[PDB]
Structure 1
Amino acid sequence: RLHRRVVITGIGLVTPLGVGTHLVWDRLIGGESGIVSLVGEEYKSIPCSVAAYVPRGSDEGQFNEQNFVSKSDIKSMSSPTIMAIGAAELAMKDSGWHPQSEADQVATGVAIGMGMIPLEVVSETALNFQTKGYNKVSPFFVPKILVNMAAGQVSIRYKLKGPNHAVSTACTTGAHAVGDSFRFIAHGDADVMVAGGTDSCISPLSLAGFSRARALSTNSDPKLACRPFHPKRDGFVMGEGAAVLVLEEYEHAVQRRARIYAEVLGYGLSGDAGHITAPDPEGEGALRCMAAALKDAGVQPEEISYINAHATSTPLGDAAENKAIKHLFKDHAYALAVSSTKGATGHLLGAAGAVEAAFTTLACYYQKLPPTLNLDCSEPEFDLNYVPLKAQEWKTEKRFIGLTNSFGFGGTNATLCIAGL
């Protein structure tokens, strides 16, 4: 009917690498990581000893809550909410879109989700209730647990009256936010979508839960703990962060004289259906969502040159994705490059797919491929180019097209197809 192209005009990053689009990118290409050792008595007795935290402060690349939100706000709202607000402020500023018009406002929606409720706030309110009773319980408790509070807050501040779609899917949230936003724009429900994910669930209880699930890396050393594709990978490293992306219809962007990073071509979604804990050993579900994304994009596998892998430094997971890439791309798999950025940021949970979407986008804009960290050596099953250790220039005779993969609990798979102009 009407074919609307969708592009990215704005990036907002609040990450374990720091804050700001240039800064976080420069650091990621440089081979930096945010993974650090846990400190304090609370954490003792917990099998994981490492996590990845957004640096807080006034210094450049440090997240300062006070710049983004008011004193009253800080007390009222959860840490994931505040990060999303900040990421969103930065993205809109990056976009230079500030809708003043009613027409512009109705044209602009939000799609920002949160993977997990912060367990600490539950526990603190629950104890307060038992100890001190109902009168004591704060009214803001329920808003603190709600997923869409982030989206609501951004919506009010930037006056965004278009489609609102907060989505929590745990590990895949950010991927669904971008993909669903793309679909909405492409359908004509909006000209502009503010999209992303946030997570800030690093806590004794949360880490306990994940450790007991056998998800987490047991390694004491923050430098080595997260090692995607590596032989010694023992589990993922929990991270915290938000990423926000402004998606826009192409002509809308072009005409307002916006800076365009990249074009969203394709979204794909699939289910494994084998098992809740365990990835499909052959990666048949990952294959299917990648291929669904390509079909959406109108692109053949041979056209893809980079993949931002969802590898999270787990034995079964990293293997599955690798099989699927090999089967999908056949001989061209040895032509492409695959990297996992999880060594730098940790697993950002809800935010993971948004930040990796932002990274894939930037890869397209700069023709530069972020490293897989800690990949010193590689087993024969892992024979592809994983951009080990050092960043690589992205070279191809055709157009720059990449995939970013987000796989989640229960066998939910998501893939985005992002291209250079």
Structure 2
Amino acid sequence: IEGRSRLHRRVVITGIGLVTPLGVGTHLVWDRLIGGESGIVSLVGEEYKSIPCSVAAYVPRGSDEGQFNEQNFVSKSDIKSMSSPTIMAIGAAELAMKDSGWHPQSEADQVATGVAIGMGMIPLEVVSETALNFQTKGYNKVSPFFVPKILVNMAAGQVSIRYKLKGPNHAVSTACTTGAHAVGDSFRFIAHGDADVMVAGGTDSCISPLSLAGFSRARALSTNSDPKLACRPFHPKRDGFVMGEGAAVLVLEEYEHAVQRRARIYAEVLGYGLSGDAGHITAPDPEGEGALRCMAAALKDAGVQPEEISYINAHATSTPLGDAAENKAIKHLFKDHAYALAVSSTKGATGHLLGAAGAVEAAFTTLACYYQKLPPTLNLDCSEPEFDLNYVPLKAQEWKTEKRFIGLTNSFGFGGTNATLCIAGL
């Protein structure tokens, strides 16, 4: 005959694990973010000679609290067999599950818990080094681990294997929209009943001369040699994004499941919206039409009116055209209400985490909901007349409301692929 009705369950976020250029550990990173810190640094080394971009954002490595020590998460042997983004994902997943208090042991809990971690790009250096090894030293020098090491889905696979997660096992690779799709897809799977818990997020760790060359050739990266100033979303002098690396993982969980085990609940995922610009492979719709459609779709999924939104964590990566288009979309969707909400882009602090960007920013939007405090857009000391909203410039803002705090987070990628998540306080 026709469609029936089915139960659509409620989904909450009960844990967050962050491995980022601001540091390692969700709450330390939040403190640093709110305090106006940044992990953008100058490139070092002759190997970056000739490339127009001279800055990036690295995960700080070492044994100190807040630094990333791979050995805390994977063994020396495991290091050789997995890629850098996979290792970061395992770290972030470990931290997220510890943050959530969810460590499935029984077969039932194992099968009820899935993984949806995406990666935006293959580890290019693993491919090129192996090719050289193969071409010079022959077949027998190729590692039996080569293929599993290089596959985009192996962050999700290894997290599943290492933590015994037997539910849905999914991995998206949608360029800079990856981390948002991972969270949204996990939300849908839980709402649908495929799993009661999902370990969701994104990872990327591919800063190298070759990758920076590629993105510079696509004219995507900032050419500013000053790492303090390079990334400045909405700023008149913005000149391209700054490549970062890291992983962000969130534990999503069915609402009753969370309540019954007395989990700490940060926020509820209310809606997920998706669209395509269908315009250009790298340039965004200049009017921001795709961004408007995915934000609108997220609001429709959530059953929320534009007027009910308090905060938008913008994608705004510090590009001339990108930031302007998103700003346009926000103003066109929210009309007079655009002046009554707050928008900020946190990429000034983290850099652009590529496949992890949408997940890290879903984490920051979740924490903004939980704390009703908004992280700043760094470096925004002035703006053009077209940028006339509250972008939380420079300094964090309190945002207290007695009504429900509801936020959106946007992610857009090459290929014109767009997603928005609608996340709310409880």
With the length of structure 1 as denominator, give the TM-score of the two structures: 0.99
User: What is the CA deviation profile of residues 353-405 of structure 1, one whole-angstrom value per residue up to 9, with x for unaligned ones?
Assistant: 00000000000011110000000001100000000000000123421000000
For 2:290 and 2:141, the matched residues in 1 are separated by 48
Per mean C-alpha deviation after superposition, the further-off stretch among 287-296 and 156-165 is: 156-165
CA shift, 1:99, in A, is 1.1
CA shift, 1:179, in A, is 0.1
Match of 1:142 among 138, 144, 147: 147
For 2:218 and 2:67, the matched residues in 1 are separated by 32
CA shift, 1:207, in A, is 0.2
User: What is the CA deviation profile of residues 15-73 of structure 1, one whole-angstrom value per residue up to 9, with x for unaligned ones?
Assistant: 00000011000000000000000001111111100000000000010000000111111
CA shift, 1:162, in A, is 0.6
Per mean C-alpha deviation after superposition, the further-off stretch among 99-108 and 83-92 is: 99-108
For 1:157 and 1:76, the matched residues in 2 are separated by 14
CA shift, 1:127, in A, is 0.7
For 1:17 and 1:171, the matched residues in 2 are separated by 19
With the length of structure 2 as denominator, give the TM-score of the two structures: 0.98
| 2:242 pairs with 1:228 | no
Match of 1:280 in 2: 285
For 2:418 and 2:155, the matched residues in 1 are separated by 24
| 2:229 pairs with 1:219 | no
SS in structure 1 opposite 2:170?
coil
Preserved contact between residue 174 and residue 417 of structure 2 (Cα < 8 Å): no
SS in structure 2 opposite 1:2?
strand
Per mean C-alpha deviation after superposition, the further-off stretch among 183-192 and 269-278 is: 269-278
For 1:142 and 1:89, the matched residues in 2 are separated by 24
Match of 2:351 among 342, 346, 362: 346
| 2:182 pairs with 1:177 | yes
For 1:77 and 1:276, the matched residues in 2 are separated by 30
Match of 2:202 among 170, 184, 197: 197
CA shift, 1:157, in A, is 1.7
Match of 2:329 among 309, 319, 324: 324
User: What is the CA deviation profile of residues 119-155 of structure 1, one whole-angstrom value per residue up to 9, with x for unaligned ones?
Assistant: 1111100111111111111111111210111111111
Match of 2:131 among 113, 126, 130: 126
CA shift, 1:3, in A, is 3.4
Structure 1 segments of 4+ aligned residues over 4 angstroms from their partners: none
For 2:44 and 2:277, the matched residues in 1 are separated by 38
For 2:44 and 2:8, the matched residues in 1 are separated by 53
For 1:91 and 1:278, the matched residues in 2 are separated by 34
Per mean C-alpha deviation after superposition, the further-off stretch among 129-138 and 203-212 is: 129-138
Per mean C-alpha deviation after superposition, the further-off stretch among 293-302 and 395-404 is: 395-404
User: What is the CA deviation profile of residues 265-320 of structure 1, one whole-angstrom value per residue up to 9, with x for unaligned ones?
Assistant: 00000111122222111111100000000000000000000000000000000000
Match of 2:366 in 1: 361
For 1:98 and 1:277, the matched residues in 2 are separated by 40
Match of 1:154 in 2: 159
For 1:403 and 1:35, the matched residues in 2 are separated by 25
For 2:334 and 2:291, the matched residues in 1 are separated by 12
Match of 1:239 in 2: 244
Match of 1:110 in 2: 115
Preserved contact between residue 57 and residue 243 of structure 2 (Cα < 8 Å): yes
User: What is the CA deviation profile of residues 240-272 of structure 1, one whole-angstrom value per residue up to 9, with x for unaligned ones?
Assistant: 000000000011000001000000000000111
User: What is the CA deviation profile of residues 299-354 of structure 1, one whole-angstrom value per residue up to 9, with x for unaligned ones?
Assistant: 00000000000000000000000000001001000000000000000000000000
CA shift, 1:159, in A, is 1.0
Say what the alpha-carbon RMSD is for the aligned residues: 0.7
For 1:395 and 1:383, the matched residues in 2 are separated by 22
Per mean C-alpha deviation after superposition, the further-off stretch among 322-331 and 137-146 is: 137-146
For 2:78 and 2:70, the matched residues in 1 are separated by 10
For 2:50 and 2:289, the matched residues in 1 are separated by 38
For 2:145 and 2:350, the matched residues in 1 are separated by 31
Per mean C-alpha deviation after superposition, the further-off stretch among 140-149 and 192-201 is: 140-149
SS in structure 2 opposite 1:405?
strand
For 2:304 and 2:388, the matched residues in 1 are separated by 25
For 1:141 and 1:118, the matched residues in 2 are separated by 11
Preserved contact between residue 182 and residue 201 of structure 2 (Cα < 8 Å): yes
* Number of equivalences: 421
Per mean C-alpha deviation after superposition, the further-off stretch among 58-67 and 149-158 is: 149-158
SS in structure 1 opposite 2:7?
coil
Question: Which segments of 5 or more consecutive residues in structure 1 lack a partner in the other structure?
Answer: none
CA shift, 1:196, in A, is 0.5
Per mean C-alpha deviation after superposition, the further-off stretch among 337-346 and 69-78 is: 69-78
User: What is the CA deviation profile of residues 200-239 of structure 1, one whole-angstrom value per residue up to 9, with x for unaligned ones?
Assistant: 0100000001001100000000000000000000000000
Per mean C-alpha deviation after superposition, the further-off stretch among 25-34 and 163-172 is: 163-172
Match of 1:382 in 2: 387
SS in structure 1 opposite 2:88?
helix
